[PDB]
Amino acid sequence: LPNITILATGGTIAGGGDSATKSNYTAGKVGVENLVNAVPQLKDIANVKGEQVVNIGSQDMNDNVWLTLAKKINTDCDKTDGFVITHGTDTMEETAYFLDLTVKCDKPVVMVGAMRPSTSMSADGPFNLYNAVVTAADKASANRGVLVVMNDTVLDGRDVTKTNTTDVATFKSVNYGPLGYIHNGKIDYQRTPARKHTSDTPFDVSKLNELPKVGIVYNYANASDLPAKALVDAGYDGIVSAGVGNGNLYKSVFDTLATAAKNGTAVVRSSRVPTGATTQDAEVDDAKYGFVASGTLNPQKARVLLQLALTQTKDPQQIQQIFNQY
Amino acid sequence: LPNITILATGGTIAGGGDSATKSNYTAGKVGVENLVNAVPQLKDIANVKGEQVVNIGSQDMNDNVWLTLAKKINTDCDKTDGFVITHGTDTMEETAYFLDLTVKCDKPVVMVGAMRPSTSMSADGPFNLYNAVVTAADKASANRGVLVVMNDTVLDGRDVTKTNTTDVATFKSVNYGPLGYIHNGKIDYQRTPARKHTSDTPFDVSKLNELPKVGIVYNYANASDLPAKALVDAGYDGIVSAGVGNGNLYKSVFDTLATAAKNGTAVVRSSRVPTGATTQDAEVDDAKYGFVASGTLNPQKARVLLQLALTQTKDPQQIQQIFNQY
Amino acid sequence: LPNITILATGGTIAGGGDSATKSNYTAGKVGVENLVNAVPQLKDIANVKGEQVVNIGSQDMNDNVWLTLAKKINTDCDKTDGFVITHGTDTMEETAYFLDLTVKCDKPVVMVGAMRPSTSMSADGPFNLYNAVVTAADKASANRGVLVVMNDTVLDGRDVTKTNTTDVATFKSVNYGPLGYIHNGKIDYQRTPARKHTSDTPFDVSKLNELPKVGIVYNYANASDLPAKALVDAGYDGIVSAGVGNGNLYKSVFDTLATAAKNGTAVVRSSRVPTGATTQDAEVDDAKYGFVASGTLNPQKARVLLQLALTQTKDPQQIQQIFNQY
Amino acid sequence: LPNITILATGGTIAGGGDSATKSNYTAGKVGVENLVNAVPQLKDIANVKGEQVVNIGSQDMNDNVWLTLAKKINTDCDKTDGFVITHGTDTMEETAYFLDLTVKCDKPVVMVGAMRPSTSMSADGPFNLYNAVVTAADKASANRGVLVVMNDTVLDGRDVTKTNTTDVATFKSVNYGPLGYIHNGKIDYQRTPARKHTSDTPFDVSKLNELPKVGIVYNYANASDLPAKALVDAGYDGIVSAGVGNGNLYKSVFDTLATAAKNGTAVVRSSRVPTGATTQDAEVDDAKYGFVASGTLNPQKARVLLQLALTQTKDPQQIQQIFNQY
Numbered sequence A, B, C, D: 001l002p003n004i005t006i007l008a009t010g011g012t013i014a015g016g017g018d019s020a021t022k023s024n025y026t027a028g029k030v031g032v033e034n035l036v037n038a039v040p041q042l043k044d045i046a047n048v049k050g051e052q053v054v055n056i057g058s059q060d061m062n063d064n065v066w067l068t069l070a071k072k073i074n075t076d077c078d079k080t081d082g083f084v085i086t087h088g089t090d091t092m093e094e095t096a097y098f099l100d101l102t103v104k105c106d107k108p109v110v111m112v113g114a115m116r117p118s119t120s121m122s123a124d125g126p127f128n129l130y131n132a133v134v135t136a137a138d139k140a141s142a143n144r145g146v147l148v149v150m151n152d153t154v155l156d157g158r159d160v161t162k163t164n165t166t167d168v169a170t171f172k173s174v175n176y177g178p179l180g181y182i183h184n185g186k187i188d189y190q191r192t193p194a195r196k197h198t199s200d201t202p203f204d205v206s207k208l209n210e211l212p213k214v215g216i217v218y219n220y221a222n223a224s225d226l227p228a229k230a231l232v233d234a235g236y237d238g239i240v241s242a243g244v245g246n247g248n249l250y251k252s253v254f255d256t257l258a259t260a261a262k263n264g265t266a267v268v269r270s271s272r273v274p275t276g277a278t279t280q281d282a283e284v285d286d287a288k289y290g291f292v293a294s295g296t297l298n299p300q301k302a303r304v305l306l307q308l309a310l311t312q313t314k315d316p317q318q319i320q321q322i323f324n325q326y
């Protein structure tokens, strides 16, 4: 059987409450060893070694954990046949895309979580973790980039996003769809992500102890420019606009970011709209203002690519070409 | 035939480009008379009257236009049989929900936009506008609150949200689904919102020339607390958290809003996640911190209700009751 | 605590396999008492009483079980506070709609199943059953027609359909959306079905020991008229067409069904396409052929209403009005 | 510019009513040249030729039109740079998948329809046809198999299905998602189908004037075996079961098809359920009965492949392997 390393960061999958029927719970309580022990059928599928990286709610996920995870997977790539990362669902899609761009290991890296705590009735965590190990162990799962496995579905790290606040079926690749469905411990893969990922990226965080500072500003009716001005005053390297519709900006936000873009700051236009691309030739002349259009990358995912783009270049046209390639 | 009044505010429905096939256009440049005359079949179903209120892109929508729209509808209520509001798609879901809470006219208020400019090859605006007046002219549309009519579907002002950046079908009521479908100028209504609207709300904006200051902060991996601090430093009346997953906050954003809530700022927990409720009784103890759970209201819709809730009370407990009723 | 009767008919919820991690299983194996005892937290919320009516896979569901179920709920109404029906997922949407039309008990009737067998890892059945009793116990669930509770969601029996083949979240009200969502054993109801249900229908099956014979024919490229001719030759009281697109017929199937309609067979145009109404005033002149347009009712559900319609009348115009009202 | 041939079969795209306002229309009415002249901008992006193959509603589509279409494209492959096929929406998902498996030309074959007739207000036909020619003219569109272009989206011929009866956004690849989105005459392709197609399939219809007869039977509560028995009596080479849930069959229909499978009839288990695979190793022992699991292929699409499968082999294990490859 293949050897696979479970890297535990915490989440509701490692979360517990005082009863199976009450909704109240705390994330990142239970250890990796207790998770694997709860699913003995793992032994039938792979030789599992569990390592606790951190034990955190993914709402408190950060650059330092991102850095640790990338370096760990890249360092330990030769000493295992595949990786599973147990992780909270809140920012799974951010971590998944960071590693999708920064992992140089060509062996399956599969992220997994749970929407119900481990102590709850009909807890999704156990079967989620089994299916994650199935995917990480499947020979066919290699060279498809960093994967998320949730609700019997294999999702690429770029397009995967949390669509619902409670539903176990929350995770979908809302623009281009899933890679494959898992039935009876077997995957029928019909799709691979075309955007370049892992070893096909120039992003190398092996020596980096931090990432360039990129914040996100929300657009809406009567939107305050104070958030944008706060990141600008702090000398932020990048600002992602969660725009309205096709990445459009409230007038006062537009004013601040137009200034910022010409005074150092890399400005990427994304959208609060959960589905579809922020396009170039819309109502915003990106060439004129020196903006970057995120495309299908939602605000949090645009932040990831911009941060990593900023380790390579400050030039908008090159960042835009990066946003057209990765 | 019924008398219906068209209140124009701008949008891509009033948008124009040099090419029917190129995607480049500018918003809110075409006058209401032109949109009506473009649809001569309108005078088969209703006697239409056009009034230009503003001519702006809804990305620049604001408190002042909202207050104007509500006062005009409330003033002209019994001079007409119903209202259609032509409007940009970007923030139509915000304006729709504001009018839903503040309009005291029991006659149909139907908001309509277009995802392609008026000059576009297969422009959606014409049939959109026709179906908007059809809905506004339908006696069965009465007492359903403020409506959004897009892609042959009647959508309630509360749940309706922009789902896709470019798709004509973008507008869906993602949690509770639509009220009715339109075919051959007739509507089969099978739903009406339970949540109280229009004249059933205690909200009265008739004597208001400003609305309380409510800003929105985004949550993500390594989220900056500077946007939040900026808003409490400017003395903002309320702050809505665009939370991660089930309304969860990055620790730094949590600390700032926890301090703001104790100091007397109204703090509402919403979600970046496009469908589902931000619930009580998950990971955040709302009673302890004096936070409010937004429920199914997304950040920009949570802002509309928090603003109006603050014209009534500053008590977090009574703001939660309002978020449970409207 | 309220008194809640569990009527078990079988399904995957009562299904079993040799392994928790193996797909293979048989339906309708384990009895009511085993199901109820498997979730002892029911004792917190209701006084639960189990009755086995059948133990079958709902692929084998039939007129006889429907009649028994209906008469059982109608006769035993004033003995209990609510009913939960454990049932296979395959035809829950048919049974739910039958009871939606035939139950006269004004108390909550909630139907439940499981997409994973009882022996499965992360079995959905236990928490599905708990949430069903919650719904059946909630006073707010009254006067909403017969309900389906799956994946923390309360769904009206009319619009609810199986959307996916293996997904625990399979059940969606695809046209008009759910009635409410369940969190921490509490329901926020925002919707109720407008279409007449339960006591508001004239469909009394109390003294019927048989239902009118209604079959379904599928439409496709080069469709055979033989399935249709077989049902006409057996003298079937009604035929519903699973039409292509907006309930359109292949010429051969059209030819057979047209002649049958004029001979006194009730012919209902439904659609194979999973969402949207089969509409009047499309490509087919219903009035000329004496066909009935199923509207939002899919072929399965078109069958259930036609059967019940054929107990009141054989007149196409009357059946059409029945399809517009129920 | 590229040379693009347009092959017209009819459809609502070639459909007309007596009013832009009213829904009533007749399909396959308008000639290919009238569609071309209705889109002047075609000449900007390609040198377009038009040929009427047939002019029918696709509800009357059949094997004869399929074989002609496949042979035409295969013969005239060298004469042009790409094909667009104007086609009805009702059975376009069937024609697309047949061509997907039979056309040996490696140049883009793009299918288009319109949900609104050419005479309708905001008719989708014109911009649909433009965007089809864009896709057909894009070199990046090559080697992706037969395509469907509807609502600014490029969909693979295998997974694409009609999702809604009237909605312009009706066509979705519901299991694996679209290939690319079309903005401003340009496509961001991020996906290609892994399943083998066009010239990579062993299927050759070049010499065939007939297709193996394959019929479809529908499963539901109390399902008549008469339709299935009628096909077996007429000596059908194949029967596809529109199963319930995971391709399950009612008692009556199961016995008939179990009998049929033993006596040489190739029987494929599909599902009425609009998304997800009909899998092996559930409740039906496929080996024991000699049945074939359709996977993600819905009944009408399982028919297409079973017809082509039956020109190679009548061995159920050979046919199953074909359903795992194409």
Ligand SMILES: N[C@@H](CC(=O)O)C(=O)O
Pocket: A010, A011, A012, A013, A027, A056, A057, A058, A059, A087, A088, A089, A090, A091, A113, A114, A115, A116, B245, B248, B283
């Ligand atoms: N707050 C949790 C939510 C979850 O995992 O379901 C986390 O992301 O860590």
Ligand SMILES: N[C@@H](CC(=O)O)C(=O)O
Pocket: A245, A248, A283, B010, B011, B012, B013, B027, B056, B057, B058, B059, B087, B088, B089, B090, B091, B113, B114, B115, B116
């Ligand atoms: N920016 C435009 C978008 C549209 O109307 O489609 C607006 O909202 O005004």
Ligand SMILES: N[C@@H](CC(=O)O)C(=O)O
Pocket: C010, C011, C012, C013, C027, C056, C057, C058, C059, C087, C088, C089, C090, C091, C113, C114, C115, C116, D245, D248, D283
């Ligand atoms: N065949 C089963 C499927 C399920 O219940 O999930 C039934 O409907 O009884």
Ligand SMILES: N[C@@H](CC(=O)O)C(=O)O
Pocket: C245, C248, C283, D010, D011, D012, D013, D027, D028, D056, D057, D058, D059, D087, D088, D089, D090, D091, D113, D114, D115, D116
């Ligand atoms: N009946 C038409 C429907 C359409 O094209 O929209 C056809 O398929 O030909």
